[PDB]
Amino acid sequence: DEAEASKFVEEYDRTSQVVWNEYAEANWNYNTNITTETSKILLQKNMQIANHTLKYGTQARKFDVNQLQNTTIKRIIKKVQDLERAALPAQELEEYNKILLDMETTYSVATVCHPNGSCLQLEPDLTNVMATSRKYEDLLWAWEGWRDKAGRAILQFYPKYVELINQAARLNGYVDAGDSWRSMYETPSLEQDLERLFQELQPLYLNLHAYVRRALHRHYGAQHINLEGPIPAHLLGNMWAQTWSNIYDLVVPFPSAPSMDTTEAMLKQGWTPRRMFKEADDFFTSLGLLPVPPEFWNKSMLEKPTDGREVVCHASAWDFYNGKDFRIKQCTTVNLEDLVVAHHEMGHIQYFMQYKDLPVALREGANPGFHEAIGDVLALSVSTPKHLHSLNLLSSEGGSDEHDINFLMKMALDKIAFIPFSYLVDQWRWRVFDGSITKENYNQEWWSLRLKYQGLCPPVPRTQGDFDPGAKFHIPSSVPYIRYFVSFIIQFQFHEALCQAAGHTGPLHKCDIYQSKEAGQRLATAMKLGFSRPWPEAMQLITGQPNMSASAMLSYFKPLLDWLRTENELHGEKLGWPQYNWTPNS
Ligand SMILES: O=C(N[C@@H](Cc1ccccc1)P(=O)(O)C[C@@H](Cc1cc(-c2ccccc2)no1)C(=O)N[C@@H](Cc1ccc(O)cc1)C(=O)O)OCc1ccccc1
Ligand SMILES: *[C@@H]1O[C@H](CO[C@@H]2O[C@@H](C)[C@@H](O)[C@@H](O)[C@@H]2O)[C@@H](O[C@@H]2O[C@H](CO)[C@@H](O)[C@H](O)[C@H]2NC(C)=O)[C@H](O)[C@H]1NC(C)=O
Ligand SMILES: *[C@@H]1O[C@H](CO)[C@@H](O)[C@H](O)[C@H]1NC(C)=O
Ligand SMILES: [Cl-]
Ligand SMILES: [Cl-]
Ligand SMILES: [Zn+2]
Numbered sequence: 142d143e144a145e146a147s148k149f150v151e152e153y154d155r156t157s158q159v160v161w162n163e164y165a166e167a168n169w170n171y172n173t174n175i176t177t178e179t180s181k182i183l184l185q186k187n188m189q190i191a192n193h194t195l196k197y198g199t200q201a202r203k204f205d206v207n208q209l210q211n212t213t214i215k216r217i218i219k220k221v222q223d224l225e226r227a228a229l230p231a232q233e234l235e236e237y238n239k240i241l242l243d244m245e246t247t248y249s250v251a252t253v254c255h256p257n258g259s260c261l262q263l264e265p266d267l268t269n270v271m272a273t274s275r276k277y278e279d280l281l282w283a284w285e286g287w288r289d290k291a292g293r294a295i296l297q298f299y300p301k302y303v304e305l306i307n308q309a310a311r312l313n314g315y316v317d318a319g320d321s322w323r324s325m326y327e328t329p330s331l332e333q334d335l336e337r338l339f340q341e342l343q344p345l346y347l348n349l350h351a352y353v354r355r356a357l358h359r360h361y362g363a364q365h366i367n368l369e370g371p372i373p374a375h376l377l378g379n380m381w382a383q384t385w386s387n388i389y390d391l392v393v394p395f396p397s398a399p400s401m402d403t404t405e406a407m408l409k410q411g412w413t414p415r416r417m418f419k420e421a422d423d424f425f426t427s428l429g430l431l432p433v434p435p436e437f438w439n440k441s442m443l444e445k446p447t448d449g450r451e452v453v454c455h456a457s458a459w460d461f462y463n464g465k466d467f468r469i470k471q472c473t474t475v476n477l478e479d480l481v482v483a484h485h486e487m488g489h490i491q492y493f494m495q496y497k498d499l500p501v502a503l504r505e506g507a508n509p510g511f512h513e514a515i516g517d518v519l520a521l522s523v524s525t526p527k528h529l530h531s532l533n534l535l536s537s538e539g540g541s542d543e544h545d546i547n548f549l550m551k552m553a554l555d556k557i558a559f560i561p562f563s564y565l566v567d568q569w570r571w572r573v574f575d576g577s578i579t580k581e582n583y584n585q586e587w588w589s590l591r592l593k594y595q596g597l598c599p600p601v602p603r604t605q606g607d608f609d610p611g612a613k614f615h616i617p618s619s620v621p622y623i624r625y626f627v628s629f630i631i632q633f634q635f636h637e638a639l640c641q642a643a644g645h646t647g648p649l650h651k652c653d654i655y656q657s658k659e660a661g662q663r664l665a666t667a668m669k670l671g672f673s674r675p676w677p678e679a680m681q682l683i684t685g686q687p688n689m690s691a692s693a694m695l696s697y698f699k700p701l702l703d704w705l706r707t708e709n710e711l712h713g714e715k716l717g718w719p720q721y722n723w724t725p726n727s
Pocket of ligand 5: 322325509510621622623624625
């Protein structure tokens with residue numbers, strides 16, 4: 142009955158706090174200090190948490206969920222019935238945990254070396270090469286080398302990973318791991334909804350793609366860019382060509398309206414990783430949102446250790462299920478890109494702090510996209526020329542329609558280009574998980590989607606043994622990706638809603654919500670719900686309506702769409718890549 146059910150969830154919450162806190166501690170210790178010992182302690186703590194998950198999950202399944210009145214209780218129990226990997230038999234669970242460890246370790250310690258020269262790590266060395274080199278061959282060296290070293294090394298693990306994650310999913314009542322991941326949205330129409338949103342961003346993406354392609358043609362040469370074909374994947378300023386704003390210098394709409402070198406500005410003005418996170422902290426509190434506790438400053442890892450010791454650099458935000466202990470682990474570089482990343486990560490921290498008083502079972506985003514969006518929303522305001530000038534990182538850019546188009550381009554290179562990338566990652570993984578793509582076809586099907594959605598081609602033909610997906614963090618780390626597609630759509634809906642609540646008029650892209658208590662209150666009420674209600678309720682609290690919608694993002698970028706159509710038309714661009722079979726000749 143009802144009494145036994147609420148007693149069970151009370152017990153689950155107390156015991157889970159302790160066990161998850163211990164697990165998080167050991168996971169943190171490994172991530173911030175990769176050694177045999179920390180690896181050993183982590184794999185053992187995996188047994189402890191799996192023990193706990195099994196005890197409570199087993200009990201939870203004995204409840205017939207739909208004989209239960211209270212919906213919150215009903216919700217916690219159905220959630221605890223999913224054992225995740227702890228559903229696996231002992232032998233397989235051991236193997237699965239080791240596979241995950243080996244994949245994440247392989248990715249985070251991989252280096253690319255010059256023969257009898259220096260070896261480069263992904264962060265910051267290879268990231269910098271991809272961002273700043275303008276030499277075709279040097280970009281290719283980094284692009285291919287990273288795949289050769291990280292991607293190829295992951296392949297040995299992946300088929301067994303897929304087998305075991307699917308097995309766990311079936312043991313929890315799903316048909317495969319991709320089914321399990323999609324269920325996080327509790328939205329039957331999810332796939333159709335995402336396809337519709339993607340299609341809505343097509344006019345903008347194709348126009349951006351055509352314009353950038355033309356600019357690359359100008360720089361890298363006619364013999365290396367097909368004006369009617371896909372773009373070589375190593376030329377977009379980013380290892381995965383997922384965000385393109387590092388090639389802003391190659392594509393600036395009005396070079397007569399230069400922008401201040403923001404990296405130079407931050408360096409000269411003595412900016413440090415600590416200052417970057419303090420600025421993000423200030424933006425959150427300016428909205429009437431929560432400051433990070435003193436403990437955050439004590440315990441976080443805000444730059445790469447110089448100890449020589451090895452870490453997982455890929456940025457992350459950590460809840461220790463204390464209601465007290467929250468940490469970021471980021472190998473912060475002093476530049477504008479990492480200032481934005483800091484805001485992204487501080488977004489997750491804010492969410493942790495807002496829902497800290499809920500049962501741990503409900504300590505999640507309304508959906509995973511909500512958790513990813515919070516930090517990015519504030520970052521949209523931080524990124525405005527007006528705000529950056531206030532931080533002394535840009536000079537006065539206001540008024541000028543030239544600076545205005547330039548700013549919109551700078552934003553589109555990231556926000557619009559990322560749409561097809563974020564969409565395709567889990568299109569690939571869902572089909573791996575459902576058995577549509579086998580290990581024979583992993584890489585070929587990845588490039589088929591790279592072509593279909595982003596209109597990119599690999600600069601060097603792929604060969605047997607390549608596994609380019611393994612060269613992207615989220616693949617060996619088994620972190621779902623569709624959350625980021627959702628985030629990019631909804632963060633603009635949030636921006637639009639918060640801006641109108643803040644009383645801002647005129648073009649959406651001119652909005653800066655700094656210090657708006659009205660905007661802060663909307664975000665806080667939504668975040669406080671955690672995972673306690675269907676996500677459309679949190680959507681409603683922020684935006685006044687319950688749907689995901691591209692209209693806000695389209696509205697933000699409307700002036701750029703008009704500019705790009707006019708520009709592309711006057712140059713006679715053919716939108717898309719009708720010569721889709723094109724690959725580099727040399
Ligand atoms: O810490 C995370 N998640 C991190 C990933 C993760 C998850 C589990 C275990 C380990 C790690 P991230 O997404 O913050 C880590 C962030 C890092 C990051 C990079 C950049 C970036 C933007 C522009 C140019 C260059 C870089 N922006 O954010 C991430 O991966 N982002 C995706 C997607 C992305 C997001 C925002 C964005 O602007 C661009 C891309 C990526 O790097 O591919 O989740 C915390 C949490 C959430 C919900 C519940 C519990 C805990
Ligand atoms: C359904 O139950 C929720 C949860 O109740 C809490 O957790 C249970 C395990 C048990 O320990 C209860 O005594 C707890 O109150 C109720 O939501 C709570 O309601 C109170 C009072 O309004 C509120 O202050 C709390 O914040 C709520 N907690 C959560 C986690 O939402 C809810 O009222 C019940 N619904 C109905 C219709 O009775
Ligand atoms: C790294 O881990 C080892 C155990 O493997 C530990 O003794 C050492 O103190 C750790 N280093 C740091 C800097 O925490
Ligand atoms: Cl790739
Ligand atoms: Cl997700
Ligand atoms: Zn994130």
